[PDB]
C-alpha cells in the first residue's frame, strides 16, 4: 500500500522536533567549547607559568565557577525564550547571544587570572 | 615543574565538562521522552485512520508549541526551579521527569482528539 499522505505530514512535524533537539545540542556544544577556548586554555597558560611556591585562591575558583554558570544561563536565555525578535532556536538567535557569552568568558578569564594566586 | 597548579585547575574544568555532559544526558532523556510518549503513540493512531484522512494543521501546531513549553518546564525543573538539590543533578532530573512524561502523554491524547480534521 502506498504511503499515506497524512503519515508523511505527521512525520514532517516530528522531523522538525527532532531537529529542534539537534539545535539545542548544537547550543550545548558551542557553550562547552566557549568555556574551553576563552577560559580554560588561557588559564592553563597562567597556571604553568607560576612559581613552585604559589598558593591558589579557591575563593577565586569559586567565583569563576558560579560566574561560568550565570554566563551560560544567560546564553541559553538569549538562544531561547529571550530572543528579542526571531524564531525559537534559530541560528540568528545564536548570532546575537554567543558573542556576548564569549566576551563574558573572556573578561572572566582576565579577572580570574588576577585573583588566581594567594 | 609545576604539575600541581595545573592538576588543580583541571579538577575544576573537568567538573564543568561533566556538567555539560549532564546537560546533554538531560537533552537525550527529553528527546526519548517525546519519541516514547508522543511520537510512537501518534504514529499508531495515524495508521488506524481511514486512508483518505486529512490532518488538521492547527492541531499539529498546538502539539509543537506544547512540546516546547513542556520541555522548557522540564529543563527549569532540572536547573533553577529545582531548589531542593544541586543545579543539574540526577535528583533534580528524577523529580521533574515524571511530570514531563505525564504532560507528554496528556498531549498525546489531546492531539488524538484533534488530529483528524472532520
Numbering used by the authors:
A (entry chain A): 2 to 119
B (entry chain B): 3 to 120
Reproduce, without paraphrasing, sentences from the article in which this PDB structure was first reported.
To combat these defenses, Anopheles mosquitoes produce inhibitors belonging to the SG7 protein family that block complement at the alternative C3 convertase, C3bBb. Crystal structures of albicin and SG7.AF reveal a novel four-helix bundle arrangement that is stabilized by an N-terminal hydrogen bonding network. In this study, we describe the structures of albicin and its orthologs SG7.AF (from An. freeborni) and anophensin (from An. stephensi), characterize the binding and mechanism of AP inhibition by these inhibitors, and determine a role for properdin in modulating the inhibitory activity of SG7.AF. SG7 family members are quite similar to one another structurally, but amino acid sequence divergence suggests that specific side chain interactions are key determinants for the observed differences in target affinity.
Anophensin, the albicin ortholog from An. stephensi, has been shown to inhibit the contact pathway of coagulation through binding with factor XIIa and high-molecular-weight kininogen (29). We evaluated the AP inhibitory activity of recombinant anophensin in the erythrocyte lysis assay and found it to be much less potent than albicin or SG7.AF with an IC50 value of approximately 350 nM in NHS and 6 μM in PDS. We obtained crystals of a variant of anophensin containing three additional amino acids at its N-terminus. This variant exhibits a reduced retention volume in gel filtration chromatography suggesting oligomerization. The structure was then determined experimentally using a selenomethionine derivative and found to be significantly rearranged in that helix α1 is moved away from the rest of the helical bundle and forms part of a single extended alpha helical structure running from the N-terminus to the C-terminal end of α2. This presumably occurs due to loss of the stabilizing effect of the N-terminal hydrogen bonding network described above as a result of lengthening of the peptide and changing the position of the free N-terminal amino group. In the crystal, anophensin occurs as a symmetrical dimer in a domain-swapped arrangement where a number of the amino acid interactions in albicin between α1 and the rest of the bundle are retained but are now intermolecular. The extended coil region linking α1 and α2 also becomes helical, creating several new intermolecular interactions that may stabilize a dimeric form of the protein in solution. Dimerization in solution may account for the decreased gel filtration retention volume and reduced activity of this variant. Nevertheless, the anophensin structure with its extended N-terminus suggests that the α1-α2 region of the 30 kDa family might be unable to form the N-terminal hydrogen bonding network seen in albicin and SG7.AF and possibly assume a partially unfolded structure that could be relevant for the interaction with collagen.
